[PDB]
Amino acid sequence: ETGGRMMALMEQQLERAYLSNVRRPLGKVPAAMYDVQVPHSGFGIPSEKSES
Amino acid sequence: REIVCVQAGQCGNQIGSKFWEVISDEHGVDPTGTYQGDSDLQLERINVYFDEATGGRYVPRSVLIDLEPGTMDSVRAGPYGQIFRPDNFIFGQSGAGNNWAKGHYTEGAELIDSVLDVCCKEAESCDCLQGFQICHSLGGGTGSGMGTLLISKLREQYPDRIMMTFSIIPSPKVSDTVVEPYNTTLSVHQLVENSDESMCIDNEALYDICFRTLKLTTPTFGDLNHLVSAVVSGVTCCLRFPGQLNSDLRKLAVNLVPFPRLHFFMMGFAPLTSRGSQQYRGLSVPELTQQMFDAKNMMQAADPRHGRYLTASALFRGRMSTKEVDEQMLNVQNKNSSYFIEWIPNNIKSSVCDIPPKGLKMAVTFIGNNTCIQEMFRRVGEQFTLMFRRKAFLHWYTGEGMDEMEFTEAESNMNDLVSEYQQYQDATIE
Amino acid sequence: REIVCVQAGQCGNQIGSKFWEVISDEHGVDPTGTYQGDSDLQLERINVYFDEATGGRYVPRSVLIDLEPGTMDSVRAGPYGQIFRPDNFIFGQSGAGNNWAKGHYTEGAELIDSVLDVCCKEAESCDCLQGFQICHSLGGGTGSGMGTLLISKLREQYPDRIMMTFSIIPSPKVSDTVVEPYNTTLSVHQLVENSDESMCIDNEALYDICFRTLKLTTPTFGDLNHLVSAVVSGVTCCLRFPGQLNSDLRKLAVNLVPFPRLHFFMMGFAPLTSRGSQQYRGLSVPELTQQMFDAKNMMQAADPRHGRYLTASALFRGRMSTKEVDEQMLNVQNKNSSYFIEWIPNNIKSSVCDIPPKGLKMAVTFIGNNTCIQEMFRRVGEQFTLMFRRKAFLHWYTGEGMDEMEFTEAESNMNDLVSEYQQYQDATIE
Amino acid sequence: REAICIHIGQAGCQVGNACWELFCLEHGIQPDGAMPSDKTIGVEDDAFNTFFSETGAGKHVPRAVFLDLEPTVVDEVRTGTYRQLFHPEQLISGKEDAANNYARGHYTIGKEIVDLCLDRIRKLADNCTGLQGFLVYHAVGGGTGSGLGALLLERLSVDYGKKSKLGYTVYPSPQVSTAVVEPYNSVLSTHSLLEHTDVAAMLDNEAIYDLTRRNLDIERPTYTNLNRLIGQVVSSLTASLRFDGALNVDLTEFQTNLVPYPRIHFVLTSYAPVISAEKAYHEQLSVSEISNAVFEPASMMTKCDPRHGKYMACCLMYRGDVVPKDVNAAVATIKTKRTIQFVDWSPTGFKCGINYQPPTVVPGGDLAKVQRAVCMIANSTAIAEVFARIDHKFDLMYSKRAFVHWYVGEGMEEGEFSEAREDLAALEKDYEEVGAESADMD
Amino acid sequence: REAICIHIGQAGCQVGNACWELFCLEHGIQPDGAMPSDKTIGVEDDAFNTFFSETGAGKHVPRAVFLDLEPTVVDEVRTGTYRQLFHPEQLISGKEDAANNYARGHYTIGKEIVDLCLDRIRKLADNCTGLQGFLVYHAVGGGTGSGLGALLLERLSVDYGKKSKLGYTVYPSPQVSTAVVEPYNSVLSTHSLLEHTDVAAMLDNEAIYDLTRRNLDIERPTYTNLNRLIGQVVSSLTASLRFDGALNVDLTEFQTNLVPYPRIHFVLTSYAPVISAEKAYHEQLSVSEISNAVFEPASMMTKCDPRHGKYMACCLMYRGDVVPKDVNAAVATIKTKRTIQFVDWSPTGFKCGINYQPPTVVPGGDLAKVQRAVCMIANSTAIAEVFARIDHKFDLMYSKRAFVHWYVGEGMEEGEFSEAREDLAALEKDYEEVGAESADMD
Ligand SMILES: Nc1nc2c(ncn2[C@@H]2O[C@H](COP(=O)(O)OP(=O)(O)OP(=O)(O)O)[C@@H](O)[C@H]2O)c(=O)[nH]1
Ligand SMILES: Nc1nc2c(ncn2[C@@H]2O[C@H](COP(=O)(O)OP(=O)(O)OP(=O)(O)O)[C@@H](O)[C@H]2O)c(=O)[nH]1
Ligand SMILES: Nc1nc2c(ncn2[C@@H]2O[C@H](COP(=O)(O)OP(=O)(O)O)[C@@H](O)[C@H]2O)c(=O)[nH]1
Ligand SMILES: Nc1nc2c(ncn2[C@@H]2O[C@H](COP(=O)(O)OP(=O)(O)O)[C@@H](O)[C@H]2O)c(=O)[nH]1
Ligand SMILES: [Mg+2]
Ligand SMILES: [Mg+2]
């Protein structure tokens, strides 16, 4: 028997604190432990320019 | 790096119950199984002893086996009993009768397949398996017989892991059972072949610890099992907390055993001191070292003053300098040089861990390999020879099915173990 | 892609009542026939098992047959009984008398034409017909005789469709009837020629599942029929819900049967666990795979450890990764390689479906083709040989009209089935 | 300037869902076929034409057909979110599957559905003015993909003739497996694909699982991840037709440069900057690092080790901010390496392409955003090891006729197994002879 | 210009933490890999390039790998304060330790992990244009440091060839000890280290404890103090590559000037103004005082007495406000002393270096701030006494095969002990022969 929706939501809320759910989620890259900023053009060095 | 525990017989199940209380306290797990700790350092190695159950809960990696369910009903009724997985309690329907042959051959072969099934289901769940840890008494009936049977099966199935046993040896002054010498001799025969490291504890040394050091007026078995639980929970501390000089069970085995038969060790834990005296003297490494080598603090009847140390290990918990540890171990080796084996250039290994046991500023656990161990086996061998020459109670074991040649083989093997310790005590350069 | 069900005899009718309760629950059909479900996914494949009557009601495409109306009146009187179409109940006026010859030759030929008329009326109304599904016991009287007769007639009329049977067979441990071996031998002779795939279940295995795994204090026939209804409703799940790797009854047949006579399979359902234990262990693909191959979870008395798997199929329901499924099936095949037939490079087929059964996060049903099924048929053949040498009760069957030559033919055909399974178990690649 | 896509069976339709999601998001077409008011202002462009055609009211509809014998996957497309994007006639579905039987798809059931498919492709091809090839997606492990893919390619090859046909095919991985009869279906499929395909790209799920574990940090991948990687590869190969660039590569130039002899048309594929956001911010990604990456076996999408063979031709496609001089310096550095070897009859081993449009990022995706990427398709003798393993599994089962009665019942002669096995044996001998290290002067 | 750092085991990783803390604070890199102050045109610097590379967004990342077989120490680095500085691939960890067995590290466990390390070193060496050596930190007393350090140095020596390899090694102290099996591991390490290292600097913990008690005022020292001193020494030796100076010294000049014969490459190290803040403002610290200080045995970081041997070469590093004439006057005064002796075949016994950057002060450090410092590395025959005591302990233990059964079970046979002991005996004879005065000039 399932105790409805609130119990299920709290049950899933108590789950993610497990280390397995943190470093091994389903079909996803594990979350970062610090903030990252994606540049406007993307990652990597821009190509260096030269005089015409 | 996770360990799987097995608790066998009454003594083993009760010590295990106190051990799981102490370990659950150190990692802040409520008796309901909920994590309630107060530092991330507690959670980051919880996997070493616990498996994860649904919605927050943690379950302890232990198998309980006994031949009569009285003890199992007592531990299930205890304050932390609920944490244990129901399918992990295994019990039969008739007692061991204090008979090794009954416990090994008749009810043993009947239940043994189900215990190996539980150990394998639990072992194959681990991502990387470290050694097993087993608690049992050698003087009993189901403890000795089924413990050694299970040790043999796990050694056949996992020969590359570590095999560890904690064992409470029979006392020379007050026996609870008449046929203790037979059960002890057969069990030591099984252990010296199967085990990698075995720790031996008397009941008389723990009573002397309680009366002299703690000055308890009326000690009870809960205190005895607490003393055992402290050292048992202490040996694995470097597996599960950070430190300045890490150590491991395999590293302990490599540093302590010079030759494969000499793997029986004594245990001690140092900062035992009564509540009245504690206000007048602060903890420090010289004080810990002095209690650590005092024979009053060793939990085996044999006294170090009658032997020599081949090797010893000290694991320190707390924030302390490594210089103090190194210089203390050098000063103790130089000042007491006659009690240290002269061919090994340094007999003491040190280890330092950052996290002390709760409520103590510092603690050390001591493991010692000493040639005084011969005395304990000698007493039993003597009692065995007095009983065996007259066929005193052999018909029970022969009626179960044992051949007398097993008794003569076990006596010869134990006598050879005593001879090997005696030979290494009196070795010389020439 | 719709299936037509036929339920014959007391055992078949009783299992069928529970099956239609489970199916009506999964698609949210009220016992009045009104749709009361809560997702469009339920309605979009309702045609597979139900026909639509005027208004809101849905009616189940099933034919009910029995020789005495007591059971049929009990099923019509049950709580979901009203959903069944009145014209679909066919019954006679006198019992089978537990006699195969009576059920097959005298009253069988009297009623059989009306059953084929109803089955043809139901089949020709379908836009595309998938296989038939029949539930009956082989040890009974009306179950064996008319089930095998009707199977023969449907195989003559629809040879291009699929023929599927679920059958309960007598165990020697707990027999309810003395003449079980004769009826079983004649029925297995009929099935091996007529059937495309036949599933076999032992009542002893369901009692052991209930007592050991579910720890029920007092299980009843409703529980055994619920476990069977669970597997029956699980095998067809990919026909009626979306998924990442669809499967079909014909795809199961093409992957499981290497040679046309080797079509007898074992069944299992994995997430069986007691209400006390459920709080202690989470569902996962390794856990499901471990229960799935455990002989404790199989519904026949023969154990896989005495034979080898030619082929097996696992259908998973739930949201899960395909990598973990593939590597679990590979690891099980590699670690236990001696139990898998070596001249087939991969013995297990996997399938994944997105929608689990209500109340479970995930579930798997397992179908296995293993040579250990020969021990069950051999046991029945032994009891037949003991009874036949003395003509123990033959006059009843001869009085209905059977020649003794049928008994020697049926024994020879069953003995040849056992020989064919035994030769592939004991063979080399060469 | 145009290409038609044909999707067959379950793997081909599911990979098609990821491909069309990507092509829509890259051009800017909404899921309902419209295009927002700001993409169509100020300038008038035709780049969508390769994959979409517009109606006179300005709705976009895509140039694809979806073929299946079971309804479920096409019914998922009909009831899903992209319901309004596809034309309903294009989504064709039968009544029952080919049940892992090549015979059921080819002889019994596909014969009924094939004429509708050919009528839809004909109606599409008549409404074109620069058709430049067919793209086909299918798996050779299953019954309908093998049987109907072969029958449809045969009919297409007779009706349209010289026009090129490029196939993306998922072959059975060397140890992960899903069904027992995969070797029989793969051998019988390969027999048909030899005569009727111009280039065949080989994929193995085990390689994409290894790549997703090693480069990205995903422990439990599912088919949507693999299908998004395949979609990125297809977008890289077809980008040369759709956007401006320094060195363009027409689809006929791939066939001219990669195939030395008419049977040697099976190619390996790899993709370089498969990377997560946390690694992407710790590293620069210059041209030379991704050029060195594409040649490591950890980057490949097929489970083969190229160190056990010799390369005959490589085609390197660079997209994004790259300048030709670094591509030339990179190729010269690769050519210097001692673990990379080319057959001595192929001295000029490389073809290059450079396009300015960087790869697109999908909202739920797992790849990072990067300024440049390179994709490679190459012809190498190492592929002969994959066929040898398929032949060993076929020989093991066929020595005892393990499952043949199904195939014989559905309409096939037992002789066809031996014919296909001898033809694939001849393909193995072709790869042994073509790869000869040297010929004697006497 | 570039140098790559390899950290092995516990001592090497913990000393690495102090080294990277110091190098970051000296260049000005924040713990998260950033740069304060301005970045516009007008000024431009490059000194970081020896140890860091920058990404296109301007983050800096260091040229190091951290290698361990147990996870705890690298997980401490992953969860510590410098989490954002290192790339996660650089922090490599196995499952279980080498349990003080050289045999277990070399034969059983290191063989699986070694290929990832070589792949990381290859990816670093490809991102260089003037690599001039590898710096390696390890202890020979433990199992993984000995076994994996030897195996990795052998593979590095075959793959990279002529490139120099400089090791900083901690030997087991002559009476302070931590494990019983230290002599066996040190002999077996030294056998491999003899063939595959260009210069080896020797350290003993007992000397750094004595130096920290006598010169600094620390009564209860711990490993963080020793690691900060080692970091200062490595920073002093590598400063010549990174900053302007009067007399520079390239890493090839060390090998040319310090090693007379190819086997005589073990050197002693010492540092002069180790002083506390309260004493530093009561005294001047001129060049002649610190030059006299470096030759006193109270300054050395190795427990050996140089009066029992002869110097062959000395390399003196001066950093800070020093003038060459003061260095010349100091060296001439040292040369005058009667208790300092050089071999008669080495008349020009000294090499000098002068750099303008004064030593950095670390906020929680215990060293005072000083305007100048000198660091010395010297080659002397006295080192033969250090090996003799390890060999004596080996001979005592090996007489009973005291622990050999562990080593033989994990794969090392028994002859290898005798082989290694004979090689170290030959090294002792080499130091006896090189130090013998020439009998005659004819
Ligand atoms: N990458 C990828 N592989 C898939 C996908 N679906 C199935 N496969 C693989 O392809 C093989 C199965 O081929 P299917 O496409 O299921 O065969 P089919 O075309 O449906 O043929 P029938 O079963 O007769 O309908 C297995 O190896 C699957 O792992 C998918 O969506 N993506
Ligand atoms: N200076 C310094 N010496 C250390 C440190 N930790 C250990 N040592 C010394 O190094 C020797 C022990 O070597 P370890 O580094 O522990 O050996 P290991 O590399 O960990 O090898 P395993 O034990 O197999 O993991 C002893 O002489 C210790 O005194 C440290 O943090 N700093
Ligand atoms: N330390 C300790 N010893 C115990 C405990 N219970 C029993 N013993 C001792 O163990 C021996 C009896 O063995 P027992 O456990 O009854 O053997 P079993 O019948 O096989 O379980 C006697 O020496 C008892 O004194 C206990 O809780 N703690
Ligand atoms: N599992 C199960 N077995 C049943 C059920 N009812 C009867 N049986 C078994 O089936 C056998 C009796 O066969 P029966 O159905 O009476 O044969 P019939 O007289 O031809 O219908 C006995 O072994 C019963 O135990 C039921 O509801 N479930
Ligand atoms: Mg399909
Ligand atoms: Mg270590």
In chain A, the residue whose alpha carbon lies closest to the alpha carbon of C321 is: A26
Among E167, E269, E278, E285, CA closest to E208 = E269
Question: Could you tell me the two tokens for C389?
Answer: 């040498």
Indicate whether residue D143 lines ligand 1 (CB < 6 A). Answer: yes
Other beta carbons within 10 angstroms of residue B348's beta carbon come to 26
D142 in contact with ligand 1, CB cutoff 6 A? yes
Measured CA to CA, the distance from residue C103 to residue C397 in angstroms comes to: 11
For D80-98, b where at least 16 C-beta lie within 10 A, e where not — what string?
Answer: eebeebbeeebbbbbebbb
Q: Which residue, chain included where needed, has tokens 């083989």?
A: B409
Report yes or no: D16 and D66 within 8 Å, Cβ to Cβ: yes
- Contact present, B and D (at least 3 Cβ pairs less than 8 Å): no
Question: What's chain B look like in SS3?
Answer: CEEEEEEEHHHHHHHHHHHHHHHHHHCCECCCCCECCCCHHHHCCHHHCEEECCCCCEEECEEEEECCCHHHHHHHCCCCHHHCCHHHEEECCCCCCCCHHHHHHHHHHHHHHHHHHHHHHHHCCCCCEEEEEEEEECCCCHHHHHHHHHHHHHHHHCCCCCEEEEEECCCCCCCCCCCHHHHHHHHHHHHHHHCCEEEEECCHHHHHHHHHHCCCCCCCHHHHHHHHHHHHHHHCHHHHCCCCECCCHHHHHHHHCCCCCCCEEEEEECCCCCCCHHHHCCCCHHHHHHHHHCHHHCCCCCCHHHCCEEEEEEEEECCCCHHHHHHHHHHHHHHCHHHECCCCCCCEEEEEECCCCCCCCCEEEEEEEECCHHHHHHHHHHHHHHHHHCCCCHHHHHHHCCCHHHHHHHHHHHHHHHHHHHHHHCCCCC
Contact D205 CB / ligand 1 (< 6 Å): yes
How far does CA D368 lie from the centroid of its chain? 23
Distance of CA B238 to the CA centre of its chain: 17
Which candidate, C267, C265, C302, C305, places its Cα nearest to that of C380? C302
Chain C residues within an 8 Å CB radius of B59:
280
Tokens, residue E332: 């001439």
| Neighbours, chain E (3 or more CB pairs < 8 A) | A, B, D
CB atoms within 10 A of CB C430: 5
Strand partners, B245: B352
Mode of pairing for the β-strands spanning B163-168 and B129-137: parallel
Give dist(CA D428, CA D391) in Å, integer.
Answer: 10
Closest listed residue to residue B55, CA positions, set A2, A28, C281, C272: C281
For residue D70, the CA-to-ligand 5 centroid distance in Å is 6
Is residue C412 helix, strand or coil? Answer: helix
- Report DSSP letters for A6-35, one per residue: HHHHHHHHTTTTSHHHHHS-BTSPPPPSS-
Touch between chain C and chain E: 3 or more Cβ pairs under 8 Å: no
- Asked whether B189 and B409 are in contact (CB, 8 A), the reply is yes
User: Does C168 sit in the ligand 4 pocket, CB within 6 Å?
Assistant: yes
Give the Cα separation of E182 and E200 in Å (integer). Answer: 19
Region for residue D320 given its phi and psi (left: phi exceeds 0; alpha: psi -120 to 50; beta: otherwise): left
Residue A32 sits at the chain B interface (C-beta within 8 Å): no
B251 Cα nearest atom in ligand 2: 23
Contact criterion met (CB below 8 Å) for B316 and B243: no
Assess contact for C32 and C55: CB atoms under 8 A: no
Nearest residue to C413 via CA among C381, C366, C376: C381
Measure in Å the smallest separation between the Cα of D414 and chain E Cα atoms. 48
Considering Cα of E269, then E270, then E271, then E274, what sign does the dihedral take? positive
> Looking at ligand 3, which residue's alpha carbon is closest to its atom 22?
B176
Decide if B55 and A19 are in contact by the 8 Å CB cutoff.
Answer: no
Q: Are D59 and D48 in contact (CB under 8 A)?
A: no
Of ligand 3's listed atoms, the one at least distance from the Cα of B180 is 23
Phi-psi region of E411 (alpha: psi -120 to 50; beta: other; left: phi over 0): left
D100 lines ligand 1 (CB under 6 A): yes
- Residue closest to B204 by CA, chosen among B302, B304, B309: B302
Neighbouring-strand partners of residue C90: C65
Q: What is the sign, positive or negative, of the torsion defined by CA atoms of E35, E39, E44, E46?
A: positive
- For residues B203 and B198, give the distance between their C-alpha atoms in angstroms, rounded to a whole number: 17
Residue C14, ligand 4, Cβ within 6 A: yes
Active site residue E253: yes
Q: How would you class C51 by CB atoms within 10 Å of its CB: exposed for 0-12, middle for 13-18, buried for 19 or more?
A: middle
Using DSSP, state whether C145 is helix, strand or coil: helix
As to burial, measured by CB atoms within 10 angstroms (0-12 exposed, 13-18 middle, 19+ buried), residue B328 is buried
Helix H or strand E encompassing E120: helix E110-125
Q: Tell me whether residues B322 and E222 touch, CB distance under 8 A.
A: yes
- Which CA distances in Å does D85 have to D18, D30, D63, D122, D219? 14, 9, 11, 21, 34
Confirm if B233 and B19 have CB atoms less than 8 A apart.
Answer: yes
E contact test, residue of D284, D321, D338, D370 with most E CBs within 10 A: D284
The DSSP 8-state label assigned to residue E285 in this structure reads -
State the smallest CA–CA distance between residue E90 and chain D in angstroms: 11
How far, in Å, is the centroid of ligand 6 from the Cα of C19? 61
Neighbour-count burial of C99, counting CB atoms closer than 10 A to its CB (0-12 exposed, 13-18 middle, 19+ buried): buried
Collect all residues of chain B within an 8 Å Cβ-Cβ radius of residue E396: 343, 345
Decide whether any atom of ligand 1 lies within 6 Å of the D133 Cβ: no
**Integer Cα distance of D24 and D31 in angstroms:** 8
C-alpha of residue E435 to centroid of ligand 4, in Å: 102
C277 touches chain B (CB under 8 A): yes
E11 C-alpha vs ligand 6 centroid, how far in Å? 9
What is the spatial distance between Cα E272 and Cα E296, in angstroms, rounded to a whole number? 9
Distance D145 CA to ligand 1 centre (A): 8
Dihedral angle of Cα D187, D189, D195, D199, to the nearest 10 degrees: -100
3-state secondary structure chain D: CEEEEEEEHHHHHHHHHHHHHHHHHHHCCCCCCCCCCCCCCCCCCCHHHHCEEECCCCCEEECEEEEECCCHHHHHHHHCCHHHCCCHHHEEECCCCCCCCHHHHHHHHHHHHHHHHHHHHHHHHCCCCCEEEEEEEEECCCHHHHHHHHHHHHHHHHHHCCCCEEEEEECCCCCCCCCCCHHHHHHHHHHHHHHCCCEEEEECHHHHHHHHHHCCCCCECCHHHHHHHHHHHHHHHHHHHHCCEEECCCHHHHHHHHCCCCCCCEEEEEECCCCCHHHHCCCCCCHHHHHHHHCCHHHECCCCCHHHCCEEEEEEEEEECCCHHHHHHHHHHHHHCCCCCECCCCCCCEEEEEECCCCCCCCCCCCCCECEEEEEEEEEHHHHHHHHHHHHHHHHHHCCCCCHHHHHHCCCCCHHHHHHHHHHHHHHHHHHHHCCCCCCCC
> CA-to-CA distance for B234 and B213, rounded, in angstroms?
20
Angstrom CA distances, C201 to C205, C224, C232, C376, stand at: 8, 10, 12, 11
What backbone torsions phi and psi does residue B241 show, to the nearest 5 degrees?
-145, 155
Interatomic CA distance for residues C68 and C75, integer angstroms: 13
Which residues, in sequence order, are CB contacts of D363 under 8 Å at separation 6+? none
Q: Does C326 touch chain D (CB under 8 A)?
A: yes
Closest residue to atom 9 of ligand 3, CA basis? B11
Rounded to the nearest 10 degrees, what angle do helices E9-27 and E223-242 cross at? Answer: 50
From the CA of D204, the nearest ligand is 1
Torsion sign over Cα B189, B190, B196, B200: negative
CA dihedral of E206, E211, E217, E218, whole degrees rounded to 10:
-20
CA distance C35 to C42: 10
Report the C-alpha gap between C85 and C73 in whole angstroms: 13
Task: Look at strands D350-355 and D131-139 and give their pairing.
Answer: unpaired
User: What tokens appear for B204 in the block?
Assistant: 């008389």
Q: Find which of E32, E127, E129 to mutate to test the D interface (most D CBs within 10 Å of its CB).
A: E127
Give the Å distance between the CA of C205 and the centre of ligand 4: 15
Alpha-carbon dihedral angle through residues B210, B216, B217, B219, given to the nearest 10 degrees: -60
Which method, experimentally, gave rise to this model? cryo-EM
Contacts of residue C66, defined as CB under 8 A and 6 or more positions apart, other chains included, come to C8, C9, C10, C13, C72, C90, C91, C92, C142
The terminus-to-terminus CA distance of chain E in angstroms comes to: 46
Could you give the CA distance from residue C368 to residue C298 in angstroms, rounded to a whole number? 10
Partner D, chain E 315-344, Cβ-Cβ below 8 Å: none
- Residues E105 and E150: their CA atoms lie apart, in Å, by 10
For residue C425, the one-letter residue type is: Q
HSE-up of residue E434 (Cα within 13 Å, Cβ side): 25
CA terminus-to-terminus distance, chain D: 50
Cα dist. B93→B68, B70, E322 in Å? 6, 11, 90
* Residues of chain D contacting C254 with CB distance shorter than 8 Å: 99-101, 181, 403, 406
Q: Cβ C286–B125 below 8 Å, yes or no?
A: yes
Number of other residues whose CB lies within 10 A of the CB of residue D195: 13
Q: Which atom of ligand 1 is nearest to the CA of D203?
A: 1
Rounded Cα gap, residues D155 and D150, in angstroms: 9
Distance CA D151, CA D149 (A): 6
Please indicate if any CB of chain A lies within 8 Å of the CB of E56.
Answer: yes
- C62 φ, ψ (degrees, to nearest 5): -135, 145
Q: Residue E155: count other Cβ atoms within 10 Å of its Cβ.
A: 16
Closest CA to B154 of B103, B201, B204, B120: B120
Q: How far is A11 from chain C (nearest CA, A)?
A: 12
Closest C-alpha to ligand 2, atom 17: E142
The Cα D141–Cα D145 span in angstroms is: 8
Crossing angle for the helix pair C9-26 and C69-77, nearest 10 degrees? 20
Ligand nearest to the CA of C15: 4
Which chains have at least 3 CB atom pairs separated by less than 8 Å from chain C?
A: A, B, D
> Whose Cα sits closest to atom 13 in ligand 2?
E142
Residue D241 contacts by C-beta under 8 Å, 6 or more apart in sequence?
D1, D3, D50, D132, D250, D251
Q: From the CA of C228, which ligand is nearest?
A: 4
DSSP C338: G
Looking from the CA of residue C143, the nearest atom of ligand 4 is 20
Chains that contact B by 3+ CB pairs under 8 Å?
Answer: A, C, E
B86 → closest Cβ in C276, C282, C286: C276
Measure the CA–CA gap between B307 and B266, rounded to whole angstroms: 13
Resolution (A): 3.2
Both ends of chain A: CA-CA distance in Å? 75
Which chain C residues touch B57 with a CB distance below 8 Å?
279-280
Structure tokens at E173: 């102290």
E83–A contact, CB cutoff 8 A: yes
Count of Cβ atoms closer than 10 Å to residue D255 Cβ: 16
Phi then psi for B158, rounded to 5 degrees?
A: -130, 65
A19 touches chain B (CB under 8 A): yes
B300/B376 Cα distance (integer angstroms)? 9
Q: Find the catalytic residue in E70, E253, E385, E416.
A: E253
Choose one of D7, D8, D10 to mutate for the ligand 1 pocket test, by most ligand atoms within 8 angstroms of C-beta. Answer: D10
